[PDB]
Amino acid sequence: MGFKVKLEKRRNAINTCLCIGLDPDEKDIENFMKNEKENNYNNIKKNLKEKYINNVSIKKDILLKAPDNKSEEFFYFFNHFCFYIINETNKYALTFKMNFAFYIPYGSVGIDVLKNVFDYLYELNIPTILDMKINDIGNTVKNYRKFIFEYLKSDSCTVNIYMGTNMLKDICYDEEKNKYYSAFVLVKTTNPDSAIFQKNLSLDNKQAYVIMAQEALNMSSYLNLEQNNEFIGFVVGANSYDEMNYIRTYFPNCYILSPGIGKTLTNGYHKSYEKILINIGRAITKNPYPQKAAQMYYDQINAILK
Amino acid sequence: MGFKVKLEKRRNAINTCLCIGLDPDEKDIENFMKNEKENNYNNIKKNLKEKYINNVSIKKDILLKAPIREEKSEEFFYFFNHFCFYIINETNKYALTFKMNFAFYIPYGSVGIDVLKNVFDYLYELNIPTILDMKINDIGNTVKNYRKFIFEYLKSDSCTVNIYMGTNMLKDICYDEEKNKYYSAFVLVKTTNPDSAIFQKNLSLDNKQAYVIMAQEALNMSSYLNLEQNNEFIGFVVGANSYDEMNYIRTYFPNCYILSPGIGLHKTLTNGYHKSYEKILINIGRAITKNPYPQKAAQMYYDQINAILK
């Protein structure tokens, strides 16, 4: 079944539009490993006892061995840290968003964890988003479509359309198995210079982020995504209230991914939940008690619900 | 040491500005394998003999194995890697630099990344200038992850970048205040091929098309961290088939490095924007790696260029 329905179902299931960001950096690891050594492998032992961990496809042997310190150590903890966050938070998460950048600085080892992370999430049947802000020319971008939607089995991804919209036709649609995928295009990002191009640049008097949205949203039609339970969304920085409001208003019925790590007046979007995914990452994974922080942000959101 | 001085060195040796694009697809690996499982593994054994192949770091015990068929998922890895070496060994004699597009090394998961790693290692030993076409972009400290991967892990000499969401990301990519080192990069200006490439020209500021408005910020950022004196720079990517935009930028700047993908439609009015070569890299990929006799296709393009009026 398509992405829209996977979200539509889960949204009811847990009534929240929270999107947990799983962007583990080096610290979190060097750390998780020690707070784990400097402990009786509490979490790594709770991890090793969740149903789906037994399914991951890569180095399932290593990851499953008793804690005890090989060269697959970094791999060991990196993968288990993610399992832990997911295990500790998935309850409050409508969907998860992993940013490729955090999984690529070590080479293949990082992609192996990533891949397990998605296998684990796919098994837990939780909506996923690879924040990879991909971009490139047609036939080349299909490589990203294969990696993301095929190898990782991801539910969606972020895409930077600056160099074209036709690329969306190679990312969101696959004419070989006739499969349709969802994507999120970078429209506006609260960045002390993101507006240098997304706002100051223009055409027909409308800013650039409005131009790409229109273009993005039109490509969504041409591809027949909606009727195929898929879609193209807009990534709109949380702290971009003015822009976040215009998009929500002028573009109602559209899916919005709001990056950041936290104020909440950001819900300048609303629709019927789900169409305004509020991303929160570091605030939860860098937080000493991930499960707690999660429910906190979980409630604070169900609060701002009405 | 420096990338700017590195190119203006290999510039002399093999006088050329040709840039070979190594973008192995799934059937380049099938073919090469078949052509190998029939000619008693000719090339593979020629690779294995080669000098610097001992400088690759991932799964070296396998890359040097005896052609396997008593393995698992190591087969694909074996041929993918040897095809890239095949090519480099074959044409690295006419190339000014090699451009590896990340997109082609990631669809199989991590295995391709290991292969990409070995390739950057290999080239590093032949001491050939490199470029990673990953077209990266992201906020603040996240890009740090790419700079590490691109420059620390693959020791690449440069990479491509999409600054649409902030020109500042370039400081984060092109500089590293912690190892106090500078890096080079090429930002996408006017990519010709995406016949859907609007935003780049229909989008404008004070009557200046976007690619123009983006080339300046790119340069203004290059001056800030001043890569210049550090033998580094921030260049641009301009499609070969963009003669209008090509002639301009190289005229309205006009000392900025240009990377031009195109031939692999095709033309040659593209050099209608040159200077000391190796500052107008011409990327030819498929036309050289899809060719039956890659060495010649390489020399062919080598002479067609090396032999140009001026």
Side-chain angles (χ1 to χ4, degrees), chain A residues 2-34 36-68 73-90 92-174 176-193 195-249 251-262 264-268 270-288 290-291 293-301 303-304, chain B residues 2-67 69-92 94-203 205-218 220-251 253-262 264 268-272 274-295 297-305 307-308:
Chain A
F3 191 37
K4 302 170 65 182
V5 290
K6 185 171 181 171
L7 292 161
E8 211 260 303
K9 274 205 63 290
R10 192 189 180 65
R11 187 242 301 178
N12 303 109
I14 52 182
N15 314 299
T16 187
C17 61
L18 165 58
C19 178
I20 293 172
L22 178 42
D23 300 346
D25 51 27
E26 228 155 5
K27 301 292 89 58
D28 301 312
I29 295 173
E30 69 182 6
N31 183 317
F32 177 69
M33 168 185 74
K34 186 57 185 174
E36 215 63 16
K37 298 295 208 308
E38 176 199 302
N39 161 49
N40 199 57
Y41 289 99
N42 216 184
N43 305 314
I44 294 182
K45 204 165 297 180
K46 294 179 64 185
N47 276 171
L48 284 176
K49 240 317 84 251
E50 282 294 49
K51 163 167 165 44
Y52 305 111
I53 186 178
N54 299 292
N55 289 78
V56 282
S57 50
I58 292 62
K59 294 173 177 172
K60 186 165 68 69
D61 40 67
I62 299 289
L63 295 179
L64 295 176
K65 296 184 174 302
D68 65 76
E73 182 187 304
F74 179 61
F75 176 81
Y76 190 76
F77 296 102
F78 188 175
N79 207 144
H80 264 297
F81 173 72
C82 301
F83 282 161
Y84 158 71
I85 292 295
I86 294 165
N87 281 315
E88 287 294 337
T89 59
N90 78 75
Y92 315 92
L94 199 192
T95 80
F96 272 82
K97 177 166 71 60
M98 282 57 57
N99 185 151
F100 183 81
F102 293 83
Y103 293 86
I104 188 57
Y106 317 112
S108 80
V109 88
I111 272 68
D112 274 304
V113 185
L114 186 56
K115 161 55 173 173
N116 286 336
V117 174
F118 280 80
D119 295 309
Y120 193 69
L121 290 173
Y122 185 95
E123 297 308 314
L124 229 127
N125 193 52
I126 283 182
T128 60
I129 306 173
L130 185 74
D131 197 325
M132 199 178 162
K133 306 177 185 75
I134 68 182
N135 62 119
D136 218 321
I137 63 182
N139 293 60
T140 271
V141 346
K142 290 178 187 178
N143 282 316
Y144 290 120
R145 178 191 65 206
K146 174 169 51 173
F147 172 61
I148 297 165
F149 302 111
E150 193 175 293
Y151 177 76
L152 300 168
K153 275 172 290 65
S154 181
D155 280 306
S156 55
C157 72
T158 55
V159 30
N160 180 329
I161 50 165
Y162 173 59
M163 62 180 268
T165 189
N166 277 39
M167 68 152 74
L168 288 169
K169 181 188 63 63
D170 291 310
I171 287 160
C172 290
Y173 179 64
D174 183 350
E176 282 185 305
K177 40 202 63 180
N178 197 56
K179 251 58 178 60
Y180 298 80
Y181 312 117
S182 302
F184 287 104
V185 307
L186 314 172
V187 170
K188 229 294 172 177
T189 73
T190 295
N191 201 38
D193 70 313
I196 297 298
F197 292 147
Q198 311 157 192
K199 291 185 68 173
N200 286 55
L201 199 71
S202 61
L203 162 66
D204 201 300
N205 290 300
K206 297 116 59 181
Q207 281 154 302
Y209 72 66
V210 172
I211 285 302
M212 290 192 314
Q214 302 183 189
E215 275 304 305
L217 213 69
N218 291 176
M219 188 56 91
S220 179
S221 317
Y222 177 86
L223 295 169
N224 296 304
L225 294 184
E226 309 310 307
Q227 43 285 73
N228 249 288
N229 281 161
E230 289 304 300
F231 76 78
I232 294 183
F234 305 138
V235 194
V236 198
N239 284 40
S240 294
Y241 316 101
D242 283 1
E243 308 84 302
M244 164 65 102
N245 194 301
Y246 180 7
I247 306 290
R248 215 320 91 63
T249 48
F251 287 115
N253 202 320
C254 79
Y255 285 90
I256 298 172
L257 172 56
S258 195
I261 321 177
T264 195
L265 29 163
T266 295
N267 268 279
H270 191 294
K271 250 296 309 204
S272 68
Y273 258 47
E274 153 202 4
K275 301 208 183 211
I276 167 54
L277 299 176
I278 296 301
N279 182 69
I280 294 173
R282 298 210 293 83
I284 299 176
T285 52
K286 292 287 190 53
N287 185 308
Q291 176 143 70
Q295 59 165 295
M296 183 167 89
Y297 286 98
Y298 177 75
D299 295 314
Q300 295 190 49
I301 285 185
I304 306 173
Chain B
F3 177 61
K4 194 165 186 176
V5 291
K6 195 177 178 184
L7 288 176
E8 59 115 46
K9 186 82 69 60
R10 186 184 189 75
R11 177 189 63 188
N12 284 175
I14 57 173
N15 308 297
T16 179
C17 70
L18 165 63
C19 168
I20 300 176
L22 188 63
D23 300 10
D25 40 301
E26 203 163 358
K27 51 181 55 299
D28 272 354
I29 302 177
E30 257 176 292
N31 176 56
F32 181 83
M33 195 192 280
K34 308 314 157 189
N35 252 293
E36 231 60 8
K37 278 178 173 177
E38 306 186 319
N39 304 313
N40 189 191
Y41 310 132
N42 189 199
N43 302 296
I44 285 186
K45 285 168 182 167
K46 314 185 74 297
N47 287 148
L48 299 173
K49 166 198 165 301
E50 290 303 323
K51 220 303 295 178
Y52 293 93
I53 193 188
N54 186 219
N55 299 66
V56 296
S57 42
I58 289 53
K59 288 185 180 183
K60 174 179 302 183
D61 55 347
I62 297 164
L63 280 184
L64 302 161
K65 189 85 70 178
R69 255 49 93 292
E70 310 184 314
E71 40 45 290
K72 44 183 65 288
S73 58
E74 233 65 305
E75 190 181 305
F76 181 57
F77 166 77
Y78 192 79
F79 292 104
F80 188 174
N81 220 152
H82 281 309
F83 175 59
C84 304
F85 285 3
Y86 168 58
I87 311 294
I88 310 172
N89 288 315
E90 272 294 15
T91 75
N92 80 77
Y94 314 125
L96 207 199
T97 79
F98 280 67
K99 194 165 60 64
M100 275 58 57
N101 191 119
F102 184 76
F104 292 94
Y105 299 84
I106 191 65
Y108 314 111
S110 62
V111 60
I113 300 309
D114 283 321
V115 170
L116 189 60
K117 174 46 171 165
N118 294 310
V119 171
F120 272 84
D121 287 325
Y122 198 50
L123 289 175
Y124 190 63
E125 288 304 310
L126 279 56
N127 205 74
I128 303 169
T130 47
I131 295 171
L132 188 74
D133 198 336
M134 187 154 66
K135 295 175 168 65
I136 61 169
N137 49 95
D138 214 305
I139 68 176
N141 275 320
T142 297
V143 333
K144 290 274 181 181
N145 303 306
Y146 295 130
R147 176 195 61 200
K148 185 188 165 191
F149 171 60
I150 297 173
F151 303 100
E152 287 166 82
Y153 187 69
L154 308 180
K155 307 188 204 76
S156 157
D157 299 315
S158 68
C159 65
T160 50
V161 58
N162 195 314
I163 59 173
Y164 175 74
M165 56 185 255
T167 154
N168 286 56
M169 63 169 64
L170 290 157
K171 64 170 56 57
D172 274 301
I173 291 149
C174 294
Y175 178 55
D176 176 48
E177 51 164 356
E178 170 175 48
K179 308 189 182 306
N180 186 55
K181 293 191 183 178
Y182 291 69
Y183 307 115
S184 297
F186 296 87
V187 317
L188 313 174
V189 166
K190 179 74 207 314
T191 75
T192 355
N193 191 69
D195 329 301
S196 57
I198 175 178
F199 307 155
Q200 280 166 54
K201 58 174 50 185
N202 293 340
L203 249 41
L205 176 167
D206 295 325
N207 275 73
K208 297 172 175 58
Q209 295 195 172
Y211 68 107
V212 181
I213 288 301
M214 202 163 52
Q216 263 288 164
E217 282 285 59
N220 294 178
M221 173 51 66
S222 192
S223 293
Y224 172 71
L225 28 63
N226 204 306
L227 312 176
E228 186 78 305
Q229 44 201 175
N230 289 282
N231 286 175
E232 302 309 312
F233 68 67
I234 283 190
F236 315 125
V237 173
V238 179
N241 64 106
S242 272
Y243 323 89
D244 294 304
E245 306 85 329
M246 189 61 84
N247 189 296
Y248 176 176
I249 307 175
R250 189 46 172 172
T251 87
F253 280 71
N255 305 171
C256 276
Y257 292 71
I258 295 184
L259 176 74
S260 181
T268 49
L269 318 175
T270 316
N271 276 169
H274 86 87
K275 177 185 176 176
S276 155
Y277 41 126
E278 57 70 45
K279 259 193 176 184
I280 178 58
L281 305 181
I282 314 288
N283 179 61
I284 290 188
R286 298 200 266 56
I288 286 190
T289 55
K290 289 297 183 62
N291 182 303
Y293 323 77
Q295 179 166 314
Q299 190 198 305
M300 178 190 108
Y301 287 118
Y302 171 59
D303 303 304
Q304 289 196 52
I305 298 178
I308 281 188

